[PDB]
Design an enzyme around this catalytic site. Structure first.
Site, PDB file in Angstrom:
ATOM      1  N   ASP D  14       0.742  -1.182  -0.039  1.00 52.68           N
ATOM      2  CA  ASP D  14       0.091  -0.017  -0.009  1.00 52.68           C
ATOM      3  C   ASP D  14       0.889   1.230  -0.025  1.00 52.68           C
ATOM      4  OD1 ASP D  14      -1.787   1.995   0.478  1.00 52.68           O
ATOM      5  OD2 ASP D  14      -3.051   0.689   1.993  1.00 52.68           O
ATOM      6  N   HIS D  16      -0.521   4.469  -0.358  1.00 48.55           N
ATOM      7  CA  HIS D  16      -1.546   5.636   0.201  1.00 48.55           C
ATOM      8  C   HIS D  16      -0.811   6.577   1.255  1.00 48.55           C
ATOM      9  CE1 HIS D  16      -4.434   3.462  -1.946  1.00 48.55           C
ATOM     10  NE2 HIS D  16      -5.164   4.663  -2.094  1.00 48.55           N
TER      11      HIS D  16
END
Ligand code: COB
Ligand code: COB
EC number: 5.4.99.1
Lengths: 483, 137, 483, 137
Positions: D14, D16
């Protein structure tokens, strides 16, 4: 009474009031002295006229739904939901259609039946049957200004009650609440009865009470050319200002071409102000309302949001003071409170996503504004001519002669000769002119724009295209292209 | 198709007129003699036209929501006027709000309507239904 | 390999290919000779580059969702729904994030867990693990062109497989699929690996096979100034053209001010074409993609439609060739097929409600276009200077020196000095310039726009405004006003 | 309140990063020593940092959807590393798609997470919970 565009004297107005209040027993609840004190005690936050001034001052577009049910408590629960869960800026009370024909008997049976059925069998709120007492219950239960929204040729008693009721705006006019809504009422009589509605507001202003009036722009909601629509709004504004009206929202219904629509609302606002001052009304506060697509909707709810929010974007960039909200249930039935709140939430989001944004001037906009102002002046000029300077009489004669002509209006007093249709960029144009008094130049431009559609589509412009355009949005697009 | 006569209008205090013009045109184009009494029509005018013109069917359009009130008792009156057996159709947006369609259809059929149409019905469907019911399809 | 902006030779490319195909056993399914014949048998309706030409020619905006799940049959059912019930014009296959880090081991585990759970535990389609075989079954099951959409620093094997798989577009770039997606990958290595991806398309084009490439415009989707975004896309377009790419879609992410966004899309298109021709690439077909709001969404689904459809309106009036669809589930999780189809239907309704409509030229748009082109040229000019004429080396040095700097990029090779914020009309501006090589006149225009927001809000321009701007849409509006 | 130390990052594959920066900023503002290991962080980096710095809590962020896979086994590994009883928080968008929240919360508590947060959780909620759990509120 004889029709003339002149302010009613106080004696005349009073003699009419005493007649009007006898039309249903709830007229006994109206006390003008008492009503002024009540109205003046309403906070500014709940006064429609004053909130509109603020909107104007802050450069914001405010959102307002349509809504109403037969029973008082239910009606109040609905408005509170729109206010609190929907985030509305202004509240309506949409009046049922029996009321609009003054059939209070039918209203009463409708209320009883709704009670028994546990759901509204009426398509609005029977304000006359509920009286001043019920209308006040509504207002005291909400925290926003209230406005009667309807479509009533003879609205005199309804107006007495809802204003004594503390509702500080009344929608309508002598043309706009006749021709789209009635088949057998003369233009003269509805002009006269709307003179009463304007003159009551005139009374209240005289006492220091501020109350808004909103001519009903969209008319039949079906391909109405901006110049014809605007001529009607400007007329009703002038006729209201003569009876003492001081706060006016002129209206327009979305046609779908952003530039055309922006041009239309700016032309409406500019020429309304221009005509008011040319005829000596120098203390009228003018605002604008843009109505989201008033034609047929697609049933698919996602598609409906596509219409709602594109319409809202046009309104915002147009600088509209107010926008009237449609819902994803529009094709099917009067919305639930949740479907209405949805429509309002989507609208308000779009408005906030476009804070302060306005369409800038372009040659394109400039040209369409010149076109609309010229068409509109042709119509108004002719009206003043026919009336020998009296716009009231000119209006009657204009409808008699087809100078004013509203597409698809069911009124027998409407000529039904003029035919609208869209051009190749979706702008609504004049296909058949009837007796609408345009110059050949003006006719030539409409034809030129329409020929472009003919060429693109490979078919002659015709009534079949009109039919196609009537169904287009419901079938998923603005322009009724063949297939 | 063979030439039959229908009465067409919009009932009660309902002013919606565009649908009426489309239905008129379509049914006319299909070969029907359309007796169009227009908008804001009470029950009696539907019956008066049916008799005057010996109509084969009565098409009641109701869009504004109050059809559940306005439509009740029509079959009764037609019968009493001697129009026993006439075809009664109702369509548009005949009840207030989005509702469960099977419940709505039964309600209006229980009122004496022969056929009952939901929002957004194409004229073409009613045209087809009418030729079938009139045995001319 | 050494990094230079020069077309790889045939031999060069082949030797890399034989290395790359060994990175997972599905590489053995790729047969270049066989794949050219397969690709050439795909109908034009299913070729992404060819349909893009069609869109351009017809002046229409086409709609495309994001979508992908772990298992083959489920993914195909999904795409079929988007096509059939959604009405998509183009189809994605969104690749899962393990694939993006070349962790085919984790993809494998993810498929088995998804099988057992009856739902996707992966956030996309593992195209490498599914191979040419799997990718072709997807393509044969649908009737629209197919494109890999992802965020992969080393996409070489993925490219070989999806293209041999009949997918006729690949999204990405050496900058745009590094800095927003990676922490530890050098700009030199991702540039080198994306040279491969571009050179593969160049091979295919040299055989008569047309395949689209789409640099990823929006980057971190969080307040990216148009000029920084556009410099990246122009750069990726040039680096692609050098390896033989001929069909390129440059992209941009919505900032929310319509005039700013339309300026950006036009400047992007205009300067992409200009630069291509200035450097001698004279046969490249350029199109544009506008992405609906890539920042935080509101959880309320009605509000979400407000964002989706306002964004579509901007795209349509901008003349975008393509628009990427958001859904009412955006704030929560990967959309069900229904929610996705809902977003596509709202989007396409909006487009059809705006058929052929374009924003006309104004002084305002003129001015903003001028500002964006000049900012963008500052950055590109400096890049060429640092690279002594080589844009690939110039790109590495620019990231080293903060000349190119992407807001919120997780890459450690990104300076993280430049700071953006909205002005009082919602336009994204430069708050802190870092080492972005602007002239004093350009920085002064940015400061002047922002001072108007400080004046309106009664607070100094600050990082707190940036924070507020980051949350504002999810809280209901574009601009992070205090309170 | 007190100068406690937390480990903060985003787990698995991930990338983000925006929420991570806001979280760092808010928790720092609240008085915490934030050891921010950043994005694309495997379980082992959360544990290494926690040991190195004698952290009072590990805040695991997961937005990209594959947290149901990535988050399994952290407690066990913390225990094996001698971090028995450390506070374990997880928030973001931790599962793929919209699901029934109570079912999700249960699922991550069953994995050994002390507190589990739903999409859109304001940092202020986690700050208040952590002050409570650490008896510094
Ligand atoms: C071609 C034609 C286009 N469609 C239209 O012309 C109607 C579209 C629209 C937007 C309605 C919503 C929508 N459909 O999206 C809305 N109106 Co209007 C807001 N309205 C107007 C417009 C009408 C102007 C005119 N004089 O004609 C006005 C702005 C004045 C307007 C006014 C009202 N309207 C009102 C209402 C309530 C409604 N209005 C509706 C019909 C609708 C559905 C909107 C809504 N949703 O709330 C309301 C009814 C709700 C419900 N049943 O629950 C109201 C009170 C204002 C308000 N609260 O919104 C007010 C009442 C006036 C009255 N006294 O009746 C319009 C235009 C509409 O189609 P059609 O559906 O009329 O007919 C069509 C026809 C021809 O193609 O075949 C079908 N069909 C119809 N009848 C029959 C058949 C088929 C067969 C086989 C039959 C036997 C019968 C089919 O239904
Ligand atoms: C401040 C911050 C703003 N929010 C954001 O920055 C995220 C917004 C947004 C639109 C997501 C949707 C949305 N929210 O509307 C979407 N992304 Co993104 C499309 N994305 C991006 C953006 C990121 C750029 C960057 N490097 O940072 C990209 C375009 C590159 C992007 C890429 C991806 N994205 C992906 C996906 C799937 C998602 N993405 C999401 C997160 C979302 C929800 C969108 C969707 N719906 O589909 C997806 C996850 C779905 C799911 N869980 O089911 C994917 C694969 C592309 C795609 N299919 O859409 C791809 C994967 C990359 C990867 N390897 O991870 C973004 C921007 C988004 O808030 P936040 O939510 O991050 O954190 C916030 C935080 C601070 O206020 O406190 C909370 N919190 C978070 N963690 C914790 C806590 C609180 C406590 C107390 C904790 C212990 C922990 C709270 O959650």
């Amino acid at each position: 009474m004889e029709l003339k565009n002149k302010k009613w004297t106080d004696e005349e107005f009073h003699k009419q009031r005493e007649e009007v209040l006898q039309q249903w027993p709830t007229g006994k609840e109206v006390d003008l002295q008492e009503a002024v004190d009540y109205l003046k005690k309403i906070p500014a936050e709940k006064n429609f006229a004053e909130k509109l001034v603020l909107a104007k001052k802050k450069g914001i577009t405010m959102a307002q739904p349509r809504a109403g049910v037969a029973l008082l408590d239910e009606h109040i629960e609905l408005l509170r939901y729109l206010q609190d869960e929907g985030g509305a800026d202004f509240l309506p009370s949409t009046i049922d259609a029996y009321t609009r024909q003054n059939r209070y008997d039918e209203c009463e049976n409708g209320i009883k039946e709704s009670e028994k059925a546990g759901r509204s069998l009426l398509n609005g709120f029977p304000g006359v049957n509920f009286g001043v007492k019920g209308c006040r219950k509504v207002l005291e239960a909400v925290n926003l200004p209230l406005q009667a929204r309807h479509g009533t040729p003879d609205s005199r008693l309804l107006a007495e009650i809802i204003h004594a009721g503390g509702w500080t705006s009344n929608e309508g006019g002598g043309i706009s609440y006749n021709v789209p809504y009635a088949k057998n009422v003369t233009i003269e009589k509805s002009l006269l009865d709307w003179q009463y509605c304007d003159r009551l507001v005139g009374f209240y202003e005289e006492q220091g009470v501020h109350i808004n009036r909103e001519p009903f722009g969209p008319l039949t909601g079906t391909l109405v050319p901006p110049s014809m629509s605007n001529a009607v709004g400007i007329t009703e504004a002038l006729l209201a200002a003569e009876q003492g009206v001081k706060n006016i929202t002129v209206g327009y219904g979305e046609c779908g071409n952003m530039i055309q629509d922006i041009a239309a609302l700016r032309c409406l606002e500019e020429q309304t102000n221009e005509y008011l001052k040319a005829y000596g009304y120098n203390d009228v506060f003018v605002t604008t309302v843009f109505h989201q697509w008033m034609g047929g909707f697609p049933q698919d709810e996602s598609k409906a949001f596509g219409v709602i929010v594109t319409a809202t974007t046009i309104a915002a960039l147009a600088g509209a003071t107010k926008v009237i909200v449609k819902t994803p249930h529009e094709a099917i039935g009067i919305p639930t409170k949740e479907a209405n709140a949805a429509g309002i939430k989507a609208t308000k989001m779009a408005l906030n996503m476009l804070e302060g944004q306005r369409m800038p001037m372009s040659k394109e906009l400039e040209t369409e504004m010149a076109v609309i102002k010229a068409e509109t002046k042709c119509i108004l000029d002719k009206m003043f001519e026919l009336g020998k300077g009296d716009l009231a009489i000119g209006t009657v004669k204009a409808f008699e002669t087809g100078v004013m002509d509203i597409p698809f209006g069911p009124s027998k007093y409407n000529a039904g000769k003029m035919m609208p249709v869209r051009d190749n960029l979706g702008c609504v144009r004049y296909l058949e002119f009837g007796n609408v008094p345009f110059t050949e130049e003006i006719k030539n431009y409409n034809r030129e724009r329409l020929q472009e559609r003919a060429k693109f589509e490979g078919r002659d412009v015709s009534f079949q295209m009109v039919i196609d355009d009537i169904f287009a949005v419901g079938k998923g697009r603005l322009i009724g292209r063949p297939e | 198709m063979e030439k039959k006569t229908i009465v067409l209008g919009v009932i009660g205090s309902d002013c919606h007129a565009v649908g009426n013009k489309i239905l008129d045109h379509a049914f006319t184009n299909a070969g029907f003699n359309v007796v169009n009494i227009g908008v804001l029509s009470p029950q009696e005018l539907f019956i008066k036209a049916a008799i005057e013109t010996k109509a084969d069917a009565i098409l009641v359009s109701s869009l504004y929501g109050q059809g559940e009130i306005d439509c009740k008792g029509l079959r009764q009156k037609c019968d009493e006027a001697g129009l026993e057996g006439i075809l009664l159709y109702v369509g548009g947006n005949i009840v207030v709000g989005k509702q469960h369609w099977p419940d709505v259809e039964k309600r209006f059929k229980d009122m004496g309507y022969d056929r009952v149409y939901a929002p957004g019905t194409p004229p073409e469907v009613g045209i087809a239904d009418l030729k079938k019911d009139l045995n001319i399809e």
